[PDB]
């Protein structure tokens, strides 16, 4: 295999050149220049609300744009819209398949989406003249489970799947417009940029990739983790993102530096991360773990600022409101908690 | 609380009533995960769902068959099923080690450590035909078979060749060795010899699920 030898050779050369190019840019470290700022202090959040009603493990949740309504998905095959202020249940949506793995809430609030082992992303119309919630579109074409879906507008949605691909869908026609290929393992998470012109994805190959929505090509690849990446979240200003993996670590990557800036880990932390999110200022990084707990991190100093304890089982999802007013945590004990 | 707030509260209470009605039927149903291989024959025994109601108890078995060959991620969805039904092709010595490795990974997984496994050894007629033929040899793939002796508690069918019984019980004990090596009693293995024309598999699954839940109740009440 002389030709394959030659191609592996060019790739080793380019990967050592890229590594050298990144090394020639690390003048200092993020922890080096943030050593002179005051510590964030101790953060102590309290469970302000507890949402009960799901009959099995909660797999996903998404905050509404108004920071009051949220949708949750559970193993029982049900979608529930909640009023976080009053704990009232606004809608209860039965699902054809009980193996849902993701849920999303349209920024306009008119649609919710879900998907899972059925390999189909289902769109539900919340505002119908008949007064009920009806499935509006079933997006088919993925060969592998749906792991994440996010709305761009009322007619555009980006999905990640278990066939190592991501797709951009036209909801009106139900057809894929762009396909994002290049990952090696299952794509577990995706995160849209604030301007929705780019998005990052984390896959089961210890790698994260940056994609251009319009061009439909990979821009950069970030490889610092050691096991499968389960969560990804963009920095509030859109110039960085954080990832959580099964290596029991959280890492921060910069887009214009093309390398990792900090690692959030401790020798006594041996549990994988299931979800990450940022406070609306970006100073605090919140991560949920397998050990039933969530950790609050000083994102600029890699110091643990607090914990979110009170769940009886694995923390499966995590989210912060668009106004930065509260944090919602889902867990395998079938409850949702709002923290402040 | 304004009138519209009270009406919203009443709607929420109606939703909660519907949720309780759903909770009853959810708790009354037992979910099973069907696992195997291409040649296992589990289809006789892209999600292929089936429902049966042996002795008025509802059972719901799932067969995930629309995914890639990597299963370390989607298999965590089934951490709360009553039992896992593992089907192997007992006559295929070449693929036996792959099945044993998959069984070990399922048994020792962190999220699947509490699930009991019902083991079906499917193609026993083909196993008997292959053993009586004499062409293929188990000791080629499993060198320890030469030092194996039939267990004293074995219950062979009358008229069955002792060679067939020895091969059958060696293959069963191969999985039982993995099952008894860890898990310290939180979960158990129920092996069954099966056939393509077996009509009593539902009763076996019913009995195994009954035993699993009875053992769980005994454990939770400090009665072991």
């Amino acid at each position: 295999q002389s030709e394959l030898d030659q191609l592996r050779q060019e790739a080793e050369q380019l990967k050592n050149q890229i590594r050298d190019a990144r090394k020639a840019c690390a003048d200092a470290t993020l922890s080096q220049i943030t050593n002179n700022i005051d510590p964030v202090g101790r953060i102590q959040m309290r469970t302000r609300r507890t949402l009960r009603g799901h009959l099995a493990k909660i797999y996903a949740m998404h905050w509404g744009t108004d920071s009051r309504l949220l949708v949750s998905a559970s193993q029982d095959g049900k979608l529930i819209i909640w009023d976080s202020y009053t704990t009232n249940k606004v809608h209860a949506i039965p699902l054809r398949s009980s193996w849902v793995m993701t849920c999303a809430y349209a920024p306009s609030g008119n649609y919710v989406a879900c998907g899972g082992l059925d390999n189909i992303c289902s769109i539900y119309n919340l505002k119908t003249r008949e007064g009920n919630v009806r499935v509006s579109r079933e997006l088919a074409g993925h060969t592998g489970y749906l792991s994440c879906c996010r709305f761009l507008d009322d007619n555009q949605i980006v999905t990640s799947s278990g066939d190592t691909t991501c797709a951009l869908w036209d909801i009106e026609t139900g057809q894929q417009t762009t396909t994002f290929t290049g990952h090696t393992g299952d794509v577990m998470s995706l995160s849209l940029a604030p301007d929705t012109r780019l998005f990052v994805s984390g896959a089961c190959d210890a790698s994260a990739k940056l994609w251009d929505v319009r061009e439909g090509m990979c821009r950069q690849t970030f490889t610092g983790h050691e096991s499968d990446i389960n969560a990804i979240c963009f920095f509030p200003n859109g110039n960085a993102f954080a990832t959580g993996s099964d290596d029991a670590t959280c890492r921060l990557f910069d887009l214009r530096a093309d390398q990792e800036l900090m690692t959030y880990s401790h020798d006594n932390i041996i549990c994988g991360i299931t979800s990450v999110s940022f406070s609306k200022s970006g100073r605090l990084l919140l991560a949920g773990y397998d050990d039933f707990n969530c950790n609050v991190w000083d994102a600029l100093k890699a110091d643990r600022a607090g914990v979110l304890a009170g769940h009886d089982n694995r923390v499966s999802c995590l989210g912060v409101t668009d106004d930065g007013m509260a944090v919602a945590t889902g867990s395998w004990d079938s409850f949702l908690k709002i923290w402040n | 609380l304004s009138a519209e707030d009270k009406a919203a509260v009443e709607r929420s209470k109606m939703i909660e009533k519907q949720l309780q009605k759903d909770k009853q039927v959810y708790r009354a149903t037992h979910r099973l995960l069907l696992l195997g291989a291409d040649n296992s024959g589990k289809s006789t025994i892209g999600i292929f769902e089936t429902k049966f109601q042996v002795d008025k108890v509802n059972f719901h078995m799932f067969d995930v068959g629309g995914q890639r060959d990597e299963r370390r991620k989607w298999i965590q969805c089934f951490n709360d099923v009553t039992a896992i039904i593992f089907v192997v092709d007992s006559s295929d010595y070449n693929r036996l080690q792959e099945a044993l490795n998959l069984f070990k990974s399922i048994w020792n997984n962190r999220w699947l450590r509490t699930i009991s496994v019902i083991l079906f050894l499917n193609k026993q007629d083909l196993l008997a035909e292959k053993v009586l033929a004499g062409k293929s040899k188990i000791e080629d793939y499993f060198p320890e078979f030469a030092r194996y002796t039939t267990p004293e508690d074995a219950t062979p069918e009358p008229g069955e060749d002792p060679r067939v019984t020895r091969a059958k019980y060696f293959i069963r004990d191969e999985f039982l060795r993995i099952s008894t090596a860890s898990g310290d009693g939180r979960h158990y293995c129920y092996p069954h010899f099966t056939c393509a024309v077996d009509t009593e598999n539902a009763r076996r699954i019913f009995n195994d699920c009954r035993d699993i839940i009875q053992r769980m109740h005994l454990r939770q009440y400090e009665l072991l």
Partner: single-chain antibody
Amino acid sequence: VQLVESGGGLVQPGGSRKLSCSASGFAFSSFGMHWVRQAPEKGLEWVAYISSGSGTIYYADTVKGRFTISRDDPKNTLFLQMTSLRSEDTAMYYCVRSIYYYGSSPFDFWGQGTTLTVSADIVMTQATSSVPVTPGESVSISCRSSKSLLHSNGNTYLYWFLQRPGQSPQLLIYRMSNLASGVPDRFSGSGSGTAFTLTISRLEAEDVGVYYCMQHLEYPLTFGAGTKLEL
């Protein structure tokens, strides 16, 4: 979505009569129902209300003890059993659907109505009961309440309805600022506690009619006298 009323007729000064409203085209079980009458020489008047699931039933003071409201969800029908009918009960009765959750739009659809002929409340005041307009111009109408409709929830429970001549009234503005689905953007709702205004910029044809302001703060719902937009 359709609401059809039947059962009206001419009764003695006193007697019994049952009114039925058959619903089709929507999830009848998920909606709360209202009965609204309109005397031939008066405006709209709330009569009775039955909640979704029949858990809450309210009546007006003028009909308490004489009228019974009921629903049969299997057949998607609403019933109004009227007994001891009086001379003041000659009106056209509407069945109105109303759904109640965060962000919902109550009183969105009104039925056609059936005509019946006999042989501590908020006062809603609508001044200037007649306004002449010209197409292509901006007009504005105001409605005042005895008590402030702000609830400290941030919500002002003031509703605007337009009734075209010969047709049923239709929702325009719900909760004093939100435009109902299917309404032109020319309509605008604004105001404060006890003082509300509805603005119609560049009014066109089919905008003529009687505009009613309704409150949904405490359940003895009261309507306005009507503005009676003219030409």
